[PDB]
């Protein structure tokens with residue numbers, strides 16, 4: 001749970017947002033802010049709530065509030081910038097999946113998926129989804145920079161689809177540098193993705209694992225972290241053996257080829273043939289659910305405005321309001337789970353049975 005100062009900052013952000021979406025609210029009790037100031041009310045509203053899929057809205061927002069140390073203004077800055085860069089693109093990327101990438105015969109997205117350069121391989125001790133990246137299979141000639149940005153966003157939004165409630169909504173990355181030579185190195189997309197990520201997927205990384213990777217390419221890190229942001233630095237962990245991989249991942253998900261019991265096909269990819277995508281046709285059912293969901297969103301906005309105003313904090317009605325907001329959030333999560341088969345092409349992880357939403 002949050003404390004009273006924390007709820008203060010969360011209220012400040014939600015207020016800014018309703019002021020963008022023109023829903024009524026009285027912030028004072030505790031006109032448009034400049035970071036948001038070039039965003040369109042109807043559009044940004046619709047997009048932000050399409051982007052709220054299996055996490056609660058408060059969580060979606062508190063991630064940005066934490067990534068800026070609870071400073072209201074830089075938080076609204078970072079967040080409005082996220083909205084202006086995400087819009088309805090990421091939605092489209094993940095709902096079209098691999099299927100509309102194959103369909104649109106986008107060459108680089110297809111090589112990257114086929115390479116299994118980046119893939120989802122299971123869970124760590126904290127039930128976070130884990131992404132195997134093995135750069136020994138990257139070449140800058142395979143894909144264009146923007147196609148690589150798209151493959152990355154897709155892999156990560158697939159990792160987000162796994163998010164266990166009551167467990168971290170972050171993703172662990174296993175970087176197998178085993179096999180890495182200077183043929184494979186492409187700095188431009190790396191920087192671009194890291195900027196992409198820190199500004200747009202804040203508080204989304206659990207651990208950055210560097211496994212059985214060079215034996216002296218660990219030392220220099222160990223005091224550089226004092227000059228790095230302590231949070232991300234503590235997230236990065238260098239391991240060099242399956243015994244150090246047991247500290248983080250359970251043996252059933254570590255691949256065999258590193259000493260695990262996960263026997264997945266790592267060299268042959270079985271792309272979605274579209275056969276669980278049968279509910280992409282039910283336009284009537286999808287709208288049935290989407291109207292129920294808009295009912296939900298309006299309830300949430302009204303209750304959230306009430307919350308932003310109502311005084312005091314010890315008032316019974318206030319605990320009533322908190323309850324309802326949690327009720328609503330959960331209703332919206334259950335609802336997305338109903339909606340999913342009607343908006344989202346089944347992904348490779350839908351077919352093998354690793355992903356249930």
Ligand SMILES: CCCCCCCC/C=C\CCCCCCCC(=O)O[C@H](COC(=O)CCCCCCCCCCCCCCCCC)COP(=O)(O)O[C@@H]1[C@H](O)[C@H](O)[C@@H](O)[C@H](O)[C@H]1O
Nearest residue numbers: 067118138152156175186190193197198201202203204205
């Ligand atoms: C050679 C090319 C390889 C092709 C290989 C390309 C294929 C890979 C495609 C996708 C891979 C997976 C996506 C990665 C998402 C990682 C999550 C993430 O966003 O990481 C961010 C941190 O940066 C990173 O994790 C590094 C990015 C990892 C993977 C993306 C690029 C991969 C390129 C790797 C280089 C080569 C391999 C070596 C391994 C090094 C790993 C970088 C956010 O940190 P976080 O603590 O979670 O929140 C921040 C917040 O956000 C900040 O603002 C705040 O200031 C701060 O206080 C915190 O709150």
